[PDB]
Amino acid sequence: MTEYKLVVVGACGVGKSALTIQLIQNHFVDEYDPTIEDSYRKQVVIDGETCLLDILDTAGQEEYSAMRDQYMRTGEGFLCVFAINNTKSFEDIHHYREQIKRVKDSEDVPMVLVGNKCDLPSRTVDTKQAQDLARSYGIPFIETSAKTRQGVDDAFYTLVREIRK
Amino acid sequence: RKEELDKKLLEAARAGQDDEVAALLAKGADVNAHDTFGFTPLHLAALYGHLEIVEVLLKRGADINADDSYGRTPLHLAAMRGHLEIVELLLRWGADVNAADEEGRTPLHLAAKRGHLEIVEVLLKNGADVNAQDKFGKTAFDISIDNGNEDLAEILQK
Ligand SMILES: Nc1nc2c(ncn2[C@@H]2O[C@H](COP(=O)(O)OP(=O)(O)O)[C@@H](O)[C@H]2O)c(=O)[nH]1
Numbered sequence: 001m002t003e004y005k006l007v008v009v010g011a012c013g014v015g016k017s018a019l020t021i022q023l024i025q026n027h028f029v030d031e032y033d034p035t036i037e038d039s040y041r042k043q044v045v046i047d048g049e050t051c052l053l054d055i056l057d058t059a060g061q062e063e064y065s066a067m068r069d070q071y072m073r074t075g076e077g078f079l080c081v082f083a084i085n086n087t088k089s090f091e092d093i094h095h096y097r098e099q100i101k102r103v104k105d106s107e108d109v110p111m112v113l114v115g116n117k118c119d120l121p122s123r124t125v126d127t128k129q130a131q132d133l134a135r136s137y138g139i140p141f142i143e144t145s146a147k148t149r150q151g152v153d154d155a156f157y158t159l160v161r162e163i164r165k
Numbered sequence: 166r167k168e169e170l171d172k173k174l175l176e177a178a179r180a181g182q183d184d185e186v187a188a189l190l191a192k193g194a195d196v197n198a199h200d201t202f203g204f205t206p207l208h209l210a211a212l213y214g215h216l217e218i219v220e221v222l223l224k225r226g227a228d229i230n231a232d233d234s235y236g237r238t239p240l241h242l243a244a245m246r247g248h249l250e251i252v253e254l255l256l257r258w259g260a261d262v263n264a265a266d267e268e269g270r271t272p273l274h275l276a277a278k279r280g281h282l283e284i285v286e287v288l289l290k291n292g293a294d295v296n297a298q299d300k301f302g303k304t305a306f307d308i309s310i311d312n313g314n315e316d317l318a319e320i321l322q323k
């Protein structure tokens with residue numbers, strides 16, 4: 001089976017670990033450890049084709065990780081997750097994209113903007129702003145909610161499809 | 166009352182408060198308490214590099230082969246983080262050197278993938294399967310080949 005390497009990047013607390021655990025084990029975990037950075041492997045069927053997704057659930061970005069460097073150097077796709085109830089994550093998405101483009105040295109990398117925590121009543125990040133930024137960068141935008149699993153599979157499959165094309 | 170004391174012990178083990186861990190253990194806290202994913206206080210102490218809390222928990226009677234929701238033992242986390250003293254102490258207390266998680270990854274796999282050569286050689290010295298295949302048919306040598314770690318490949322071969 002073809003192996004696609006994905007990196008779940010973003011700010012701390014946005015929900016990268018929750019999204020990845022929701023995808024691989026179909027349940028929601030709260031108060032997950034914010035410093036453990038583990039790579040998971042998930043066998044999926046997309047458009048009828050079977051693939052293996054190796055997802056780096058990024059964490060501990062303050063320190064240096066050789067595995068994180070290797071993943072970002074050879075990253076086939078990125079989930080630039082941000083929390084809609086947190087403006088700072090939406091601001092740091094640009095810095096993360098700049099770092100990814102610098103390390104990859106490529107003007108076109110498969111990235112997907114993800115707005116987590118859609119279930120929360122607060123909407124401090126407007127959907128219009130995220131849609132406009134995604135359109136400007138020409139990349140899909142999916143709103144997910146690891147607490148209710150609304151769109152986790154859709155977001156990951158969209159990222160895989162972006163990898164394919 | 167049980168749950169709150171358990172959570173306080175877990176947060177003290179994670180944060181690295183020897184005085185708080187001692188007070189909570191003397192207060193009746195459960196050493197086998199697990200959070201939502203399953204991290205016991207020994208999981209968090211091995212993960213965060215707190216040698217003293219690891220010693221206190223192992224003396225008090227903390228389970229050393231407990232696994233979280235993904236089947237990772239405290240030895241798994243101590244290997245993935247690169248805490249040589251902690252892995253040596255856990256293996257001294259007879260921690261499973263060939264434990265398998267939900268992907269069937271030996272702590273050797275995590276130590277090799279993260280790039281910690283000293284953890285890899287310590288685990289090999291203490292009886293770790295060099296030719297161990299996970300649930301996706303990969304070994305430590307396969308990890309070294311994929312990551313291009315020449316020193317890790319040399320250590321595994323010899
Ligand atoms: N409602 C809701 N809460 C979330 C979601 N994702 C994460 N959380 C909460 O955020 C807290 C920590 O987020 P976490 O996943 O550890 O952040 P990360 O490790 O930086 O990706 C957890 O206690 C979750 O309850 C989501 O999609 N919806």
Ligand SMILES: [Mg+2]
Pocket residue numbers: 016017033034035036057058059
């Ligand atoms: Mg995380």
